[PDB]
Amino acid sequence: NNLETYEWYNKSISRDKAEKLLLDTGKEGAFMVRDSRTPGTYTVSVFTKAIISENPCIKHYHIKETNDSPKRYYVAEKYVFDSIPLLIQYHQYNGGGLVTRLRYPVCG
């Protein structure tokens, strides 16, 4: 199911790099993702546009997993899915809370 292909996915990424990558572009609710190790989910680097004296906050959202049917992964005891992409696709569209429900998957 590897994602390594979503503007938002960033393999081997960390919490700092994603923010760094996000900071590079700095969009509204920049969306990024990074593999972890937990039950097998992925991380989501979300960045909020801003600068001046501050305002741009980058949040790393991990995709929780829940042996559902399928809705396994999620990032808010909410919309659960079987993959970050759908989990992201759902955020990217719908309105899965998040900085801004995946507004722009950052792909460093």
By the 8 A CB rule, do 10 and 21 touch? yes
User: Domain coordinates of the chain in residue numbers?
Assistant: 1-108
Distance between CA atoms of 49 and 57, rounded to whole angstroms? Answer: 7
By the 8 A CB rule, do 91 and 29 touch? no
In one-letter notation, the amino acid at residue 37 is R
By the 8 A CB rule, do 45 and 18 touch? yes
By the 8 A CB rule, do 46 and 29 touch? yes
In one-letter notation, the amino acid at residue 84 is I
Q: What are phi and psi of 94, to 5 degrees?
A: 0, -115
Within 10 Å of residue 59's Cβ, how many Cβ atoms? Answer: 18
First to last CA, the chain: 20
Tokens read off for 67: 């042996």
Tokens read off for 66: 């829940």
Distance between CA atoms of 55 and 63, rounded to whole angstroms? Answer: 25
What is the second-level CATH architecture of the domain 1-108?
2-Layer Sandwich (3.30)
